[PDB]
Amino acid sequence: TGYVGLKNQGATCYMNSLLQTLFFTNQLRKAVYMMPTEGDDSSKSVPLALQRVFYELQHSDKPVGTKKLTKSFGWETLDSFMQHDVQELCRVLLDNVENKMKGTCVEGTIPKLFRGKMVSYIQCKEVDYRSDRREDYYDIQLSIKGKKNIFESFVDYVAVEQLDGDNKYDAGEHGLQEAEKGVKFLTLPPVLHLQLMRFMYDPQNIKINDRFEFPEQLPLDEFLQKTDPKDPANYILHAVLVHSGDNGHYVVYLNPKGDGKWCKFDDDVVSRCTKEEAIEHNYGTNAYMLVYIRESKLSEVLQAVTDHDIPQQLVERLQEEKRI
Numbered sequence: 071t072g073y074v075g076l077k078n079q080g081a082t083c084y085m086n087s088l089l090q091t092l093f094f095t096n097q098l099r100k101a102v103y104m105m106p107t108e109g110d111d112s113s114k115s116v117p118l119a120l121q122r123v124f125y126e127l128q129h130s131d132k133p134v135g136t137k138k139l140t141k142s143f144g145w146e147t148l149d150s151f152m153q154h155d156v157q158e159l160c161r162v163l164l165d166n167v168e169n170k171m172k173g174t175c176v177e178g179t180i181p182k183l184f185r186g187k188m189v190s191y192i193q194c195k196e197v198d199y200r201s202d203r204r205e206d207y208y209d210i211q212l213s214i215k216g217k218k219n220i221f222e223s224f225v226d227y228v229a230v231e232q233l234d235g236d237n238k239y240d241a242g243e244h245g246l247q248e249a250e251k252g253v254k255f256l257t258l259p260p261v262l263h264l265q266l267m268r269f270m271y272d273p274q275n276i277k278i279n280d281r282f283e284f285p286e287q288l289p290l291d292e293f294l295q296k297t298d299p300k301d302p303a304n305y306i307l308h309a310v311l312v313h314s315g316d317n318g319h320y321v322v323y324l325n326p327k328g329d330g331k332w333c334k335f336d337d338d339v340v341s342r343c344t345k346e347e348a349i350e351h352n353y354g355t356n357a358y359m360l361v362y363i364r365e366s367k368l369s370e371v372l373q374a375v376t377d378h379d380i381p382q383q384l385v386e387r388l389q390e391e392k393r394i
């Protein structure tokens with residue numbers, strides 16, 4: 071394969087799956103490597119530790135470990151990971167990093183890669199008041215239950231809600247009202263993170279192992295409020311985060327370079343796999359998170375990274391950390 075795996079400290083759950091997804095977002099990786107953490111405390115800097123993992127994943131020939139990272143952002147209590155969603159963890163990481171890039175030549179890489187804009191709206195049926203609020207997003211959560219595939223989930227996401235009695239809308243000057251709330255997409259990011267809502271509550275939270283489908287390629291101009299002839303919103307499955315069981319095991323399937331050559335990443339064991347094993351076979355063992363990249367940004371996002379693309383201070387500081 072060439073590619074190298076992560077150690078198990080146990081209970082990390084989705085952490086190892088997320089870390090590889092980030093590592094193989096090549097334009098992220100370079101920018102992480104270009105952050106200025108010369109004079110930072112090794113043991114409680116998130117950005118520093120993210121560089122270690124990234125650097126090791128690039129070079130190490132043995133299973134890489136993550137012990138110091140877990141330490142840096144302080145999830146050590148017996149429930150930390152069980153009690154959170156992937157989107158949460160991600161946010162913890164890319165947050166710290168967005169903030170470390172401020173000032174530098176790579177400032178605002180994260181928003182450039184993962185951020186898009188949304189339009190929430192409420193419209194009154196017989197009366198004239200509309201409320202429009204714009205919103206940035208860095209990920210989106212999709213409805214599964216009673217949905218066959220992605221396309222319905224989007225259709226559902228943009229479905230117009232109604233506001234009848236018992237749930238009538240307070241318009242202030244015009245009192246209670248029958249109204250329609252919806253959501254609509256202004257723009258979709260180069261790198262599209264989608265979470266599948268599989269963990270839901272009942273007489274007591276539970277996992278829905280129901281069959282959900284996703285394609286290799288995903289056109290979203292349908293859902294754009296206004297399209298563009300030159301950059302249309304088609305997307306290429308890069309990553310597929312998988313859980314199996316209940317109480318189980320968390321694996322990720324990637325095609326790092328983008329070419330449709332797949333690999334199963336199970337902690338320390340990375341092995342080549344079929345496309346069927348990464349897509350259909352995880353329709354429902356099944357997927358909870360999906361990563362798509364936009365065809366027009368594929369080459370930039372997944373730009374190649376040399377061993378020279380790491381700075382020297384960085385490299386040296388790490389070498390010495392290993393020695394002792």
Ligand SMILES: O=C([C@H]1CCN(Cc2ccccc2)C[C@@H]1c1ccccc1)N1CCC(O)(Cn2cnc3ccccc3c2=O)CC1
Nearest residue numbers: 084152155156211265266267268269277313316317318358
């Ligand atoms: O890793 C988990 C697990 C938490 C822990 N449980 C049991 C468990 C496993 C391992 C050790 C101890 C106990 C199993 C969870 C699980 C559920 C379903 C699919 C896979 C794993 N999760 C939570 C769900 C997830 O965040 C996906 N997502 C995102 N956003 C949502 C927004 C709104 C509504 C639902 C969701 C939702 O389900 C993935 C990470």
